[PDB]
Symmetry: C3
Subunit: 80 residues, 3 copies
């Protein structure tokens, strides 16, 4: 099944706040890693709409005050 | 340049050695492994689709009825390797 | 609104972190991610302006280090939403 792999790279301080947004958006799960260049979230979303809803919330709420980038990659889910 | 399958396996850290063995025994030339929250995340650029699916089937069938996990594929264009 | 970009990923030996970071920056990359990985190794991810930049960075890293150090370089298509 084709899915959207939404990736959010932002400042580590927003880890708890962004994780809440992902969960409240109805994301079934997500990965989070520490990165240099910060924290990187990866979320396979049900549909495009959910990927965009999470992206819009994060951006609108934190991207005037915080550094970050958001992107989508196409993923084909085999299991899970 | 060559189109390849980037197989990604996210599962519990306890299965690191077991999953690594499956990748290697499938004939994977190499793989990346990282610790993750939300766990261990494997990334493997496979020769062909068939090998990507073989590894995915093996891991899922063997561990997923007992452990948490997700397996997916992303298209990658290999420039060097 | 949205823009397609090249997500260049470089996985190599941790010893080359500083050297590869310098190549990315000198190529004109606006930013990049770097993580520690097993398989120590280091993984860079760079969303490049265009394909040409992705390939310039890849050619420099590969030609200058891959005969002596281990590594792979690939590109994945990314759709940038914010940033």
């Amino acid at each position: 099944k084709r899915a959207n792999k939404l990736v959010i790279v932002t400042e580590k301080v927003l880890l708890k706040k962004v994780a809440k947004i992902i969960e409240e958006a109805g994301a079934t799960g997500y990965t989070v890693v520490d990165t240099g260049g910060n924290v990187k979230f990866e979320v396979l979303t049900e549909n495009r709409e959910m990927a965009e809803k999470i992206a819009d919330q994060v951006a609108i709420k934190f991207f005037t005050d915080y550094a970050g980038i958001i992107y989508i990659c196409e993923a084909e889910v085999l299991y899970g």
